[PDB]
Design a protein around this ligand. Structure first.
Ligand code: ZN
Ligand code: ZN
Ligand code: ZN
Lengths: 280, 575, 152
DNA sequence: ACACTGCGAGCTCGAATTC
DNA sequence: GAATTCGAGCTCGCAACAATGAGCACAT
């Protein structure tokens, strides 16, 4: 159904992140919903990635490198609550850092940047309008979530590169905007299945209980039940025609010709996702 | 037998079961027949009355549509003391009609045999001067409407607005920007039943569409409306709700509140107040030439906001000064002391629609309120003087209780740390000062101004620093109090169950929850159960918080007894 | 016909004629497309007006600088600040700079003074419309009886 | 041959209760 | 039945009001 994704998350670190109108720290309410966002992203998208960049004082510093590590992100967002966040941000320096790595990904994916942006001013030493011709050439998809106002760049950066621009009503709207950024838009990788506890077959390296890639030999290690939930969307079961003694619960299929009741009929298509007669 | 979820009592009382499969087709039947008395979550209880059946036959159901569908939803069999009552109060509806035509009031009957019966009563012969008609005086239209109910030939005020050809049909049109919720569509359907407007009373909560129904009814009759209100603040809201949802220019929406006077002679919608149309003293000259214009033009759809103040002595003379065809009344709290709400059934008409206050909470149109009657014990120094005196000085004693001062200061601190907008409603204005200066909080004392009343209220909404506010008897109407989240009500008026349904109107405009501070073992304990008597009949549940969640651990005022001895000497020095 | 005939009964009094309609109109909107406000007294309850005696004192020049600072942090992409004259624009901007107020406005937005000569003005206007289109945003502080107030 | 707009007095109500 | 407490709106007297800057399109 969906495709692979390499999402970057640009987090604003300006003077305006000390603002109110949110949970105690405007910065803190951003990092609170981002930890919720990393969990739901990696759950619905199994083999994708997340980078997190934080822009501060006319410069961009990479908080976490681009890797599919659903633990290293949340353990780094907990550290960044005590950030200083002084100075005016940048947007040329942050989208270029998100372009030196995201350009060299293979073309079968959906490379994306997501900017969470509270300041109004991007003091950056060059012209932004040549990036939007470069990012459109490299098939990146930059989408901005704005705070408290609408900036002209963030409209023309979104609608030319291909993303969306959205401004916050409140915190119930800010969770609604981040929830819409987990569904993937409609190749052959080589991952290593990590049987035996959690060890790597290619380099035989033992490490932690994780769906993460292997550092010693560079292989990605996924768990096959986590891949298994994405099945049954492709070739799902066709419904039955319905016109006592049952076959499911023992108290009509067009394939195996075994009747069902009503509780069983709703249960087969909702949770079981297979016909109990057809497995025989 | 397991179906048919009613129990028609032999006097008259209808116990509807709100867990039945046919409940939704039996709750959309009993609204059109009976009036609700109590509505808990399981078994509702309606009630048949005389006025509730006049609203039934005014809609297209006749006397054989009601008395047959009661048998098919009975569970008992109708007890033959209701077949004699339904037949009596439905065949005597459309016989005597009160219609006006070009500034003259006429009592009309199609059957001449009841006019020969009507013209022997000695009080209807005082209000004088096929198709039999006789002209009645305008200034004795209230004493006429009592008598037609007194002999069971009630008057109907069904404005037939589709074709009258006398009134200047104005261009009020409801724009497609305001879509109305499915309870507002049901109230207007019961009003404009047969394609003719009907004079009734619609009871909707203030957080619900109490004003959108009034605008939509004005765009429906499309005649010269006239909106009334209880205050000069309430008409600057009614002016704003007409520009928001009805596409009217500012050369037609006028006002009559002694400060603006936007050329009130010759308009289409006039938004005035009570006690301006019924001001019984020598009026000013600008108001005299408007009242000479307003006393001689037949309106259509007078909109009487805050209906529960109409049966007063001065506010019911408005309905004889102004001549209107149909009279809609919009309110939120229909209950009122002194037993004059049954008197309102002939000043305006039958009660049309009451919103189910729990159905609007389960669908999201109203905030889920967690009522909590936290009561505080009495201090042993204050109860020493409470039982020694009886003559009104003990009202200060159960108001300025030091142990009630701690529960106000604790509940303010407990919700300032959750970023909640706190409103402390507090009457008895001596204790408004002594509560709001010991916590350094703003207070709308009531004789403050018009100026700093408007900026203290605006520093409360668009500022995340000022968090509490101490109102005093001002917010007992439909004012612009800006969407509070808690409401720590302290020591209000005596048994006003109208008040604690207007204090509740601030909260629903758990999500939000309001308290009620009571000094226990005093006279306020008997009062605070008289005022929940209306709210438990709507579904609300009042918990009791005997001891708060860790009150003694923070830095609360009046810790020692030395600082408590000084407060009693401040209270007892008033006398 | 114009857009801002302010009282309609003045123009037939000055110009000796008698109209037959003398009408006014208002535009319809799908939102509130404008939010007019009258920011009166200062943040410490000091009057803000530009009289002739209330111009030298620094309790008003600070309250103009404290306003343009706190509006340049919440308004995106362009603020036009019309002053009453040119000798009041000089004597306020050069009295914001000696205090610590013009330092904090240049952190948010660039500021482009509209001068009297047309060569510098068209330079400062083309950079203003460039600064509103890229990230930073700008402040075109000008004069109300000026060239930019009627043409642009 | 002086004088605009806010703002407090009386005046008369209402709501609910004491007296 | 006749007060009170605290709110309301409507009139209406009362005291005193204010007003500082700078330049190009159009006829022989
Ligand atoms: Zn490996
Ligand atoms: Zn099968
Ligand atoms: Zn079965």
């Amino acid at each position: 159904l969906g495709m692979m994704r390499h999402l970057y998350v640009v987090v604003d670190g300006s003077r305006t992140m000390e603002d109110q109108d949110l949970k105690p720290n405007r910065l803190t309410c951003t990092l609170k919903l981002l930890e919720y966002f990393v969990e739901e992203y990696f759950d619905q998208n199994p083999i994708s990635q997340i980078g997190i960049i934080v822009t501060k004082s006319k410069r961009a510093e990479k908080l976490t490198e681009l890797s599919g590590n659903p633990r290293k992100h949340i353990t780094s967002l907990k550290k960044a609550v005590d950030m200083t966040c002084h100075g005016e941000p940048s947007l040329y320096n942050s989208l270029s850092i998100a372009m030196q790595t995201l350009k060299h990904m293979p073309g079968h994916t959906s490379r994306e940047v997501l900017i969470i942006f509270s300041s109004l001013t991007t003091c950056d030493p060059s012209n932004i309008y040549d990036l939007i011709k470069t990012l459109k050439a490299a098939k990146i998809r930059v989408s901005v979530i704005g705070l408290s106002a609408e900036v002209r760049v963030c409209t023309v950066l979104a609608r030319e590169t291909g993303g969306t621009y959205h401004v916050i009503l409140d915190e119930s709207h800010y969770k609604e905007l981040l929830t819409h950024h987990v569904s993937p838009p409609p190749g052959n990788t080589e991952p290593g299945l990590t049987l035996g506890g959690y060890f790597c077959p290619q380099c035989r390296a033992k490490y932690c209980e994780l769906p993460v890639e292997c550092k010693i030999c560079g292989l990605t290690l996924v768990s096959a039940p986590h891949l298994a939930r994405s099945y049954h969307h492709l070739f799902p079961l066709d419904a039955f025609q319905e016109i006592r003694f049952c076959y499911g619960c023992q108290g009509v299929c067009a394939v195996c010709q075994n009747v069902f009741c009503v509780d069983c009929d709703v249960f087969v298509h909702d949770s079981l996702h297979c016909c109990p007669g057809c497995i025989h | 037998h397991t179906s048919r979820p009613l129990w028609v009592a032999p006097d008259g009382h209808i116990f509807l079961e709100a867990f039945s499969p046919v409940y939704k087709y039996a709750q959309d039947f009993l609204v059109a027949i009976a009036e609700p008395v109590c509505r808990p979550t399981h078994v509702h209880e309606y009630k048949l009355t005389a006025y509730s059946l006049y609203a039934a036959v005014s809609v297209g159901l006749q006397t054989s549509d009601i008395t047959e569908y009661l048998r098919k939803l009975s569970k008992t069999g109708v007890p033959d003391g209701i077949m004699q009552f339904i037949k009596l109060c439905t065949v005597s509806y459309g016989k005597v009609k009160l219609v006006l035509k070009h500034n003259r009031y006429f009592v009309e009957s199609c059957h001449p045999d009841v006019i020969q019966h009507l013209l022997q009563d000695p009080v209807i012969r005082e209000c004088r001067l096929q198709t039999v008609s006789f002209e009645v005086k305008q200034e004795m239209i209230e004493e006429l409407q009592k008598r037609c109910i007194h002999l069971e030939y009630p008057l109907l005020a069904e404005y037939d607005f589709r074709n009258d050809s006398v009134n200047p049909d104005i261009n009020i049109d409801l724009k497609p920007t305001a879509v109305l919720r499915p309870y507002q569509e049901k109230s207007l359907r019961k009003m404009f039943g047969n394609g003719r407007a009907r004079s009734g009373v619609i009871v909707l909560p203030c957080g619900a569409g109490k004003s959108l129904v009034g605008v939509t009814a004005a765009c429906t009759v499309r005649k010269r409306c006239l909106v009334l209100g209880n205050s000069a603040v309430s008409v600057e809201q009614w002016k704003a709700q007409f520009k928001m949802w009805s596409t009217i220019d500012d050369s037609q929406i006028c006002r009559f509140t002694s400060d603006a006077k936007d050329k009130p002679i010759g308009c289409s919608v006039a938004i005035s107040t009570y006690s301006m149309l019924g001001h019984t003293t020598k009026r000013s000259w600008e108001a005299e030439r408007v009242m000479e214009w307003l006393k001689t033009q037949e309106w259509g759809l007078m909109i009487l906001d805050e209906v529960h103040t109409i049966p007063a002595k001065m506010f019911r003379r408005v309905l004889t000064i102004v001549q209107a065809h149909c009279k809609l009344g919009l309110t939120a709290t229909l209950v009122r002391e002194d037993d004059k709400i049954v008197d309102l059934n002939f000043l305006i008409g039958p009660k049309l629609y009451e919103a189910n206050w729990m159905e609007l909470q389960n669908n999201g149109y109203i905030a889920k309120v967690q009522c909590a009657e936290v009561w505080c014990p009495m201090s042993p120094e204050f109860y020493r003087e409470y039982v020694a005196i009886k003559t009104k000085k003990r009202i200060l004693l159960y108001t300025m209780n030091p142990n009630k001062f701690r529960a106000c200061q604790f509940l303010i601190k407990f919700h300032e740390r959750r970023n909640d907008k706190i409103i402390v409603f507090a009457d008895n204005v001596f204790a408004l000062k002594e509560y709001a200066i010991r916590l350094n909080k703003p207070y709308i004392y009531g004789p403050t101004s018009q100026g700093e009343r408007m900026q203290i209220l605006q520093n409360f909404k668009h500022n995340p620093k000022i968090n509490t506010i101490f109102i005093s008897k001002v917010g007992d109407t439909s004012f612009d109090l800006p969407e509070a989240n808690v409401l720590i009500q302290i020591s209000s008026h005596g048994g006003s169950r109208r008040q604690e349904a207007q204090r509740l109107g601030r909260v629903l405009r758990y999500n939000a929850f309001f308290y009620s501070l009571v000094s226990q073992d005093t006279q306020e304990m008997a009062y605070s159960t008289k005022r929940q008597r209306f709210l438990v009949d709507q579904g609300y549940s009042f918990k009791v918080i005997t001891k708060l969640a860790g009150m003694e651990e923070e830095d609360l005022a009046f810790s020692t007894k030395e600082e408590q001895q000084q407060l009693l000497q401040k209270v007892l020095a008033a006398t | 016909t114009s857009g801002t005939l302010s009282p309609l009964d003045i123009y037939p009094k000055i110009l000796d004629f008698h109209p037959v309609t003398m009408a006014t109109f208002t535009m319809t909107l799908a939102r509130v497309c404008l939010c007019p406000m009258i920011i009166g007294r200062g943040n410490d309850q000091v009057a803000i007006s530009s009289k002739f005696e209330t111009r030298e004192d620094i309790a008003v020049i600070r309250n103009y600088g404290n306003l343009l600072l706190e509006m340049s942090a919440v308004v995106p992409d362009g603020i036009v600040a019309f002053f009453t004259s040119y000798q009041y624009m000089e004597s306020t901007v050069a009295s914001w700079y000696e205090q610590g107020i013009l330092e904090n406005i240049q952190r948010n937005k660039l500021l482009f003074i509209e001068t009297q000569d047309g060569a510098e003005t068209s330079v400062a206007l083309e950079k203003y419309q460039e600064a509103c289109e890229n990230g930073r945003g700008a402040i075109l502080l000008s004069v109300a009886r000026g060239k930019v107030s009627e043409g642009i």
